[PDB]
A paper describes a structure:
Thus, G9a has emerged as an attractive target for SCD therapy. Our data suggest that BCL11A and ZBTB7A promote H3K9me2 by recruiting G9a to the BGLT3 gene locus, resulting in suppression of BGLT3 lncRNA transcription and subsequent γ-globin expression.
Further optimization studies finally generated RK-701 (compound 10), which potently inhibited G9a with an IC50 value of 23–27 nM, and GLP with an IC50 value of 53 nM. The pyrrole nitrogen and the adjacent carbamoyl oxygen and nitrogen atoms form hydrogen bonds with the main chain atoms of Asp1088 and Tyr1154. The pyrrole ring forms a π-π stack with the side chain of Phe1087. In addition, the aniline amide forms a hydrogen bond with the carbonyl oxygen of Leu1086, and its benzene ring forms a T-shaped π-π stack with the side chain of Phe1158.
Author numbering:
A (entry chain A): 917 to 1190
B (entry chain B): 916 to 1006, 1010 to 1191
The structure:
């Protein structure tokens, strides 16, 4: 079947680049059972602290590439290299919080510590996969450590998440201390709502602070964990919490030799304990 | 002969769509730094703007929002944008409702002028008699968006007690409590726009990515064709000058000046008759 292009830009011009949609698998048209938003939204108010006097900020008179940058120190160091990519030694299993520079800092808008707030730069495509519904793939090579996109949706409380019927787009912010919040991309979301789980993932989520530092509401940034080839599907590890629940209802279709959540893998992890 | 020096390549530090340089060919005054340049309004207490996406009025247009059927255009009061993004008015103050994240239209539709930011080239420069001012670096057709009045959102009760009121902009909320934008400590290029009795820009209230009626945003549009080099200015209003004329008079130098010593005396002469 021909790979028809069915939307020139699912983001309707809201991103720095278009995100087209194609389907060469079945007759499903472009997905429209949600509202594309490029930045997080609220229905009920979350009362995010946006008091500018509450911000920690730097006093740098350079490009914030020195070890003197107070915003880099809020994460030990600035984990961005000169090209805006995560460093090699960056912890990819236990990422630190990133504090980017903000409107209170003395530095310029193009300092070295503003990667996520500058938006999508790589060419992505929404496409129909063979076995996992819609997915997202790269239309270019992407070096390791490159910012891909943010997990964008509706900010909700943990209590609201628990009464939501469809949890297939629910991202837990993992607030360890105090009030717990989630991003639900079911009704409002961006391209990230279509990114599938891979047991051999090529992107990782990182918690980032930009225009506010209300620690209840980290923003979720995906960075590539290795070099990604053109045409390669993007995916992150949804985590054992997700699969511990969902695997009762469906198993992983990633098809990797390393797959941890397939029907075969589940049967092995069960036949063992027996 | 004193030469003009470029003393800052961009007072906005890269936050605007274009750089806004500062020059001084008048005196020894250094680039103004007794404030924090911000490109968007800030808060220093709980304002918590209502951004509930489900409560935004929005349109369903599948075109570029150029038709009269666009709900957002229909909500706008006594004004509209032409095909080039220029504001036309009837001349009750105008009120603009731009399209937003809830509308079905694209980010580049015809009802997105103010939210797309500064497009005209402006310069902060030292004036002869009015301190710093802002002038055009290009021809600006009538109705063109110039810049937004940006600063610290405060309640009118807080505005009543601020010590330096030289940068205080009253939003004049009709229904509900009144709020103000104070650009004294945090502000953008607009904090430097002087009063002119022959003004060439006008402030217009606008809603964009929220419709929290406490906080219209203030957008300046040209009220006539402006030539390169002309100082930009708006009418600060009689309420400003009724109070401030005790302390200083208007130095705009226009033959139409309303607030010089001579104009005030003449107005007092007219009232006495
Ligand atoms: C992967 C991850 C998450 C996360 O929420 N995943 C989602 C899966 C992906 C969403 C796109 C769906 C998840 O588990 N949903 C979920 C769980 C249970 C039920 C039920 N019944 C329903 C839905 N939260 C953090 C991570 C991290 O890697 C690190 C962190 C600090 C950013 C914190
Ligand atoms: C001009 C204007 C305003 C406005 O606040 N001006 C400022 C002057 C300019 C600021 C850049 C300084 C103003 O008066 N300050 C002020 C008044 C009294 C005292 C004392 N003691 C101190 C300071 N507010 C609207 C307008 C309009 O034209 C229409 C509107 C609907 C947008 C509503
Ligand atoms: N590895 C996977 N194996 C099977 N199904 C998956 C896998 N990854 C994602 N999915 C499906 O996609 C859902 C998660 C969505 N956030 C991803 C986009 C989804 N594919 C869609 O078409 O809307 C899951 O709840 C599954 O239904
Ligand atoms: N027409 C005017 N005549 C005299 N002073 C003016 C005039 N317009 C503005 N000013 C001065 O500028 C102040 C308002 C500021 N928002 C404008 C920028 C100011 N010129 C500065 O250098 O910072 C007023 O309180 C006056 O001190
Ligand atoms: Zn810094
Ligand atoms: Zn910086
Ligand atoms: Zn900083
Ligand atoms: Zn798998
Ligand atoms: Zn419309
Ligand atoms: Zn609209
Ligand atoms: Zn529109
Ligand atoms: Zn005057």
């Amino acid at each position: 079947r021909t790979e028809k292009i069915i939307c020139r830009d699912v983001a309707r011009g809201y991103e720095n680049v278009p995100i087209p949609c194609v389907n060469g698998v079945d007759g499903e048209p472009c997905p429209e059972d949600y509202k594309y938003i490029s930045e997080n939204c609220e229905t009920s108010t979350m009362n995010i602290d946006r008091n500018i006097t509450h911000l920690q900020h730097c006093t740098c008179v350079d490009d914030c590439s020195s070890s003197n940058c107070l915003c880099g120190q809020l994460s030990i160091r600035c984990w961005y290299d000169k090209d805006g990519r995560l460093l090699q030694e960056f912890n990819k299993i236990e990422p630190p919080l990133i504090f980017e520079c903000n409107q209170a800092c003395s530095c310029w808008r193009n300092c070295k510590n503003r990667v996520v707030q500058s938006g999508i730069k790589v060419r992505l495509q929404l496409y129909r996969t063979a076995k996992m519904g819609w997915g997202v793939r790269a239309l270019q090579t992407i070096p390791q450590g490159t910012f891909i996109c943010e997990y964008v949706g509706e900010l909700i409380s943990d209590a609201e998440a628990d009464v939501r019927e469809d949890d297939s787009y629910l991202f837990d912010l993992d607030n360890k201390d105090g009030e717990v919040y989630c991003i639900d991309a079911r009704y409002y979301g961006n391209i990230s709502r279509f990114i599938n789980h891979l047991c051999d993932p090529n992107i990782i989520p990182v918690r980032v602070f930009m225009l506010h530092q209300d620690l209840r509401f980290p923003r979720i940034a995906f960075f590539s964990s290795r070099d990604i080839r053109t045409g390669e599907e993007l995916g992150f590890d949804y985590g054992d919490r997700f699969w511990d629940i969902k695997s009762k209802y469906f198993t992983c279709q990633c098809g990797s030799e390393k797959c941890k959540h397939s029907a075969e893998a589940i049967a092995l992890e069960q036949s063992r304990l027996a």
